[PDB]
Design a protein around this ligand. Structure first.
Ligand SMILES: *C(=O)[C@H](CCSC)NC=O
Ligand SMILES: [Mg+2]
Ligand SMILES: [Mg+2]
Ligand SMILES: [Mg+2]
Ligand SMILES: [Mg+2]
Ligand SMILES: [Mg+2]
Ligand SMILES: [Mg+2]
Ligand SMILES: [Mg+2]
Ligand SMILES: [Mg+2]
Ligand SMILES: [Mg+2]
Ligand SMILES: [Mg+2]
Ligand SMILES: [Mg+2]
Ligand SMILES: [Mg+2]
Ligand SMILES: [Mg+2]
Ligand SMILES: [Mg+2]
Ligand SMILES: [Mg+2]
Ligand SMILES: [Mg+2]
Ligand SMILES: [Mg+2]
Ligand SMILES: [Mg+2]
Ligand SMILES: [Mg+2]
Ligand SMILES: [Mg+2]
Ligand SMILES: [Mg+2]
Ligand SMILES: [Mg+2]
Ligand SMILES: [Mg+2]
Ligand SMILES: [Mg+2]
Ligand SMILES: [Mg+2]
Ligand SMILES: [Mg+2]
Ligand SMILES: [Mg+2]
Ligand SMILES: [Mg+2]
Ligand SMILES: [Mg+2]
Ligand SMILES: [Mg+2]
Ligand SMILES: [Mg+2]
Ligand SMILES: [Mg+2]
Ligand SMILES: [Mg+2]
Ligand SMILES: [Mg+2]
Ligand SMILES: [Mg+2]
Ligand SMILES: [Mg+2]
Ligand SMILES: [Mg+2]
Ligand SMILES: [Mg+2]
Ligand SMILES: [Mg+2]
Ligand SMILES: [Mg+2]
Ligand SMILES: [Mg+2]
Ligand SMILES: [Mg+2]
Ligand SMILES: [Mg+2]
Ligand SMILES: [Mg+2]
Ligand SMILES: [Mg+2]
Ligand SMILES: [Mg+2]
Ligand SMILES: [Mg+2]
Ligand SMILES: [Mg+2]
Ligand SMILES: [Mg+2]
Ligand SMILES: [Mg+2]
Ligand SMILES: [Mg+2]
Ligand SMILES: [Mg+2]
Ligand SMILES: [Mg+2]
Ligand SMILES: [Mg+2]
Ligand SMILES: [Mg+2]
Ligand SMILES: [Mg+2]
Ligand SMILES: [Mg+2]
Ligand SMILES: [Mg+2]
Ligand SMILES: [Mg+2]
Ligand SMILES: [Mg+2]
Ligand SMILES: [Mg+2]
Ligand SMILES: [Mg+2]
Ligand SMILES: [Mg+2]
Ligand SMILES: [Mg+2]
Ligand SMILES: [Mg+2]
Ligand SMILES: [Mg+2]
Ligand SMILES: [Mg+2]
Ligand SMILES: [Mg+2]
Ligand SMILES: [Mg+2]
Ligand SMILES: [Mg+2]
Ligand SMILES: [Zn+2]
Lengths: 96, 62, 48, 74
RNA sequence: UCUGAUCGUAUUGGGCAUCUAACCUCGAACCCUGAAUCGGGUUUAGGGACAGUGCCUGGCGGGUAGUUUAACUGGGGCGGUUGCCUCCUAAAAUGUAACGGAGGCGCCCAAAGGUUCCCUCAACCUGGACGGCAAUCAGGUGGCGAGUGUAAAUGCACAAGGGAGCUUGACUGCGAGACUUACAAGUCAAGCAGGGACGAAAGUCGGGAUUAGUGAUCCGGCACCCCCGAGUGGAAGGGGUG
RNA sequence: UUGCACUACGAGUAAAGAUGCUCGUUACGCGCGGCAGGACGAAAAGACCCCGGGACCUUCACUACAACUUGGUAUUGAUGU
RNA sequence: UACUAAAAACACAGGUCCGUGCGAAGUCGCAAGACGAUGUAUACGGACUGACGCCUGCCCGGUGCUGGAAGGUUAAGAGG
RNA sequence: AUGCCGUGGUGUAAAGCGUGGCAGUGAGACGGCGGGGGAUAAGCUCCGUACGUCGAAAGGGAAACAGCCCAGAUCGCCGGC
RNA sequence: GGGAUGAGCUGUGGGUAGGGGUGAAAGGCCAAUCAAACUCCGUGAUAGCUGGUUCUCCCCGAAAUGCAUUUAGGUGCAGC
RNA sequence: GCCGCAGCGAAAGCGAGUCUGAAUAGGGCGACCCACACGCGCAUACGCGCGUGUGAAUAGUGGCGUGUUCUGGACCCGAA
RNA sequence: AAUAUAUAGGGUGCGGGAGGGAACGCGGGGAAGUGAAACAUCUCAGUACCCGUAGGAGGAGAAAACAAUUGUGAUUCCGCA
């Protein structure tokens, strides 16, 4: 910047560390289970890959934004809190 | 070859979910006795990089 | 001549406040009633 | 040689909102040293005598026993 | 068998002295050697666990090597100056240069802060033991000429000036909205909750009449919170908040 | 050496010292031999000064190293006191 | 000072100081080795003065150089 | 007096503002007016001016004459004001 | 013009090499070059500095100010 | 494998939310069509929440051109 | 041999080495200009250069390996991460 202390040395560093052992979760909403699977059924981790809602070879996690009216039977890692409420309200189940 | 990024700007800036760029504020690491709590709360948290520095900061992060 | 003293609590011994006094006008340790956020109420505070 | 030459920064004092001008609540009206103007209805003083606004309205100036005042008509 | 003393043995270090066998000798002789002031070997005369050399470590070190040694400036050097705060220049908003004109700051105060109540100053005049132009008293006059911890300007007699009572808001969690601004910073803030001070209440209080009394980042230090813990349980280290 | 060329002088004017611009005044066209006032004549990207870079030189500028020097340990052992 | 300086500059014989006891001190080399010198303090290396004559005063606080070790300060190793 | 800030009218195409791509500039010059430094000297120096021209603007005028006065060249004409 | 039996001059052969040599000492000389030779290579060294950068036309059109700067003939951001 | 598909937090973690905090207080960052009748406990009217759609407007990614930019000698020429 | 056991050495007889080559390979020594708008840590770069030594390729190569409660199973090389 011409001699004054630059913008990348005036400001302080962002606080914290990065977790070396952080486990990520790919994400599907429960309103996408409704649109992709309108008649319900067994919704596994492999059927969400092929229908184009989650990636390959990753831990999944079912969150709860949307309206679920289908009667699904969803199997996934690490369900949410508002997601179990909307799946069992439609008569389904939710196993790990 | 492949484009290197600036190691100092990646430790001082980051991006939000809609593409804004944020930073922390200065005058807070030491000499904190004479600074009243009306000043250390103004200097707390994060703000957005100002619109006149957003072009040099974008081309250091990328 | 005016050092920076710090005020530790009397119950939890947390060091909540920092201020300045005069060493020669006030040779002893200051005692003030200040709000302690750990206890949630006003306690006593000597120096360290 | 000289012993002069140093000055300070300019502090940008003065009336920041004139008469009849519609303000929002919290707006700095007359920044100054001391009480050149005094606070009136819906105007609070401030630490360094800054004379901000307490309620949205229009600024009007007047006299209240020799001291000239800033008020806000809600 | 505790405190102290002294004697003895064993095992270990440091001094001093002697020894020879490592090592040392450009002292001497002999052989390889026919030709050798080289080298090597044998023997002898001496030195001797020292010296020399390896590794570690202090010293000393322009002998040598790499470099640094600021800018403004009526040329450069010499002298001076560099950040902050107030005034004038500055042309009746704000801002405005010069090595233009004057001055302050790198603090101070545990009350000189917070609150509730109460008071009016300086100067002049008249009377009074020591007492004088001027100490304290008494009475007239006096609307700001005194005072403000500290420079100047803007304020302040409604007092922000003087005095007294109780006190710690010289708070923790925040902050709608603004000023100023290239950016970094700087500054003001109604109001909401916690737990308090003073007040009968209304209310006021996030230091000081206001603006100077200060230093970005990096790297660290300490206190606490228990967030991560390189297979696991811990720990070392790291992280947050002051 | 060389941007040109049928390349006057005076008083002005202009980047402040004009063959080239203004207003005048003077001068037939071309050579040859001489003199050196001007063409800011030619020659050398000023040696002075200043700003930036370099080199080499000095020291009680800084940070290093060789040389010299101290101690421990290794080579390195025995016996007395 | 070849190529703008031949001088009052350097050298010089004489002087004094300091170092050197002998594969010396000093120098050239990482070393071996070499010069010194086939020399041995009347010799050799360094520094300054510069034939000769008469002379060369006072100062050891500062900075060196030489000697000393009572005291303080001070490394690795040993100790743990 | 002007200047400045807000507002309600009236007028005005190539004004304003927010956000992206690519810049150049950061040596200024004289003249009008208000000032500082200078001797109320300078073709001097340093600031102010919704002031001008040159810079980056040709033409006409001031004899010549970047910066003064008139006026801003799209092209053509042997027309006019 | 100076020396010209001397510290003379000269021929032939040899030795000393680049932070080195050699120097009766001038920073002199080391192949017409020396306050550190020459040649190849690193190498197309770097230069906030000077020079240069080539065909056309149509629309619009600046700036020489602010703030910061080991900065003042450079540059970042704003202004245009 | 890369970019897109969910963000927030220093992180544990929670997830159309989340961090801060004592807070169902306020902020930060993130998400969220009422141009649309209708139906709903709406109604002086616009709305509130959710259906039905009248079937509203999001969107990325890979190639090839261009303008700048990064690392390379990087527009070309030139030192001591 | 000195000198005794013997060795150093010498006599004789068969093999082998030496030096060259444009690149590539392995092992060892190792810059500065430069970039950091100065500079020494750092960079330039284990680059340029030098030394030893090969082969038609060389080096590495048969777990005292990774991994994380499951597992992969010598090395080299190319693409990702
Ligand atoms: C100074 O005048 C002198 C002469 C330069 S020539 C104009 N400087 C050095 O010799
Ligand atoms: Mg900290
Ligand atoms: Mg604090
Ligand atoms: Mg006291
Ligand atoms: Mg001063
Ligand atoms: Mg001022
Ligand atoms: Mg040197
Ligand atoms: Mg260098
Ligand atoms: Mg200068
Ligand atoms: Mg001068
Ligand atoms: Mg003004
Ligand atoms: Mg004005
Ligand atoms: Mg009080
Ligand atoms: Mg008072
Ligand atoms: Mg304080
Ligand atoms: Mg806020
Ligand atoms: Mg309360
Ligand atoms: Mg009470
Ligand atoms: Mg308050
Ligand atoms: Mg204050
Ligand atoms: Mg004050
Ligand atoms: Mg740093
Ligand atoms: Mg572990
Ligand atoms: Mg810890
Ligand atoms: Mg906090
Ligand atoms: Mg003629
Ligand atoms: Mg003339
Ligand atoms: Mg003429
Ligand atoms: Mg002509
Ligand atoms: Mg002639
Ligand atoms: Mg001449
Ligand atoms: Mg000439
Ligand atoms: Mg020149
Ligand atoms: Mg010395
Ligand atoms: Mg000569
Ligand atoms: Mg010797
Ligand atoms: Mg002697
Ligand atoms: Mg001497
Ligand atoms: Mg002499
Ligand atoms: Mg002599
Ligand atoms: Mg002495
Ligand atoms: Mg633009
Ligand atoms: Mg500049
Ligand atoms: Mg300028
Ligand atoms: Mg100007
Ligand atoms: Mg004038
Ligand atoms: Mg001028
Ligand atoms: Mg120009
Ligand atoms: Mg013109
Ligand atoms: Mg124009
Ligand atoms: Mg004209
Ligand atoms: Mg004319
Ligand atoms: Mg003769
Ligand atoms: Mg003669
Ligand atoms: Mg003669
Ligand atoms: Mg020869
Ligand atoms: Mg020569
Ligand atoms: Mg050199
Ligand atoms: Mg290179
Ligand atoms: Mg170049
Ligand atoms: Mg135009
Ligand atoms: Mg600086
Ligand atoms: Mg720019
Ligand atoms: Mg994140
Ligand atoms: Mg929220
Ligand atoms: Mg070979
Ligand atoms: Mg280097
Ligand atoms: Mg550099
Ligand atoms: Mg450079
Ligand atoms: Mg072969
Ligand atoms: Mg092999
Ligand atoms: Zn407590």
């Amino acid at each position: 910047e011409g001699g004054q202390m630059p913008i990348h040395m005036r400001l302080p560093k962002l606080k914290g560390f990065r977790n070396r052992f952080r486990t990520e979760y790919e994400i599907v909403n429960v309103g996408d289970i409704n649109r992709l699977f309108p008649q319900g059924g067994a919704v596994g981790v492999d059927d969400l890959v092929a229908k184009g809602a989650v990636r390959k070879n990753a831990l999944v996690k079912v969150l709860g934004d949307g309206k679920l009216t289908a009667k699904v039977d969803v199997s996934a890692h690490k369900f949410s809190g508002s997601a179990r409420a909307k799946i069992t309200a439609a008569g389904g189940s939710a196993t790990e | 070859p492949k484009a290197k990024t600036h190691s100092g700007a990646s430790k001082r800036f980051r991006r939000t979910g809609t593409g804004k760029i944020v930073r922390q504020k200065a005058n807070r690491r030491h000499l904190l006795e004479h600074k009243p709590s009306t000043r250390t709360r103004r200097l707390d948290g994060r703000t957005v990089v100002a619109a006149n520095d957003t072009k040099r900061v974008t081309s250091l992060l990328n | 001549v005016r050092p920076k003293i710090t005020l530790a609590c009397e119950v939890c011994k947390h060091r909540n406040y920092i201020t300045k006094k005069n060493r020669r006008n006030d040779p002893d340790r200051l005692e003030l009633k200040k709000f302690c956020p750990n206890c949630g109420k006003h306690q006593a505070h000597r120096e360290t | 040689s000289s012993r002069n030459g140093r000055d300070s920064a300019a502090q940008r004092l003065g009336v920041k909102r004139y008469g009849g001008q519609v303000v929002k609540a919290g707006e700095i009206l007359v920044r100054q040293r001391g009480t050149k103007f005094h606070p009136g209805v819906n105007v609070g003083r401030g630490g360094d005598d800054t004379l901000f606004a307490k309620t949205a309205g229009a600024v009007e100036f007047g006299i209240k026993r020799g001291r000239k005042t800033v008020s806000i008509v809600g």
